[PDB]
Ligand binder design. Structure first.
Ligand SMILES: *[C@@H]1O[C@H](CO)[C@@H](O[C@@H]2O[C@H](CO)[C@@H](O)[C@H](O)[C@H]2NC(C)=O)[C@H](O)[C@H]1NC(C)=O
Ligand code: NAG
Lengths: 36, 36
């Protein structure tokens, strides 16, 4: 499963994605490059 | 354990609970009923 963390629509439009029950070696703008 | 269903992890780990219990127990040793 995938979940999204957001601080609210009114304040910002930036979210953080959380992939549940997966080890970060086959996850692949959110593919790579950003902070993992 | 991967068959179509998942098990989510608890929010508070064991150390969290142990530290709460130690705090309560030290409080009841030193203060008594006052800290309640
Ligand atoms: C995610 O996968 C990587 C790679 O398979 C795991 O890295 C291994 O870590 C152990 C413990 O340090 C080493 O003995 C292995 O040699 C590592 N693998 C490789 C290919 O070098 C990593 O532990 C995995 N993460 C989780 C949480 O399971
Ligand atoms: C947006 O919502 C948050 C809710 O935590 C509130 O604190 C903030 O004042 C709101 N801002 C505006 C501009 O509505």
């Amino acid at each position: 499963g995938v979940s999204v963390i957001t601080p609210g629509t009114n304040t910002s439009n930036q979210v953080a994605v959380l992939y549940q029950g997966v080890n970060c070696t086959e996850v692949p703008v959110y593919s790579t490059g950003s902070n993992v | 354990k991967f068959n179509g269903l998942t098990v989510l992890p608890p929010l508070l780990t064991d150390e969290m609970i142990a530290q709460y219990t130690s705090a309560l127990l030290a409080g009841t040793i030193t203060s008594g009923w006052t800290f309640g």
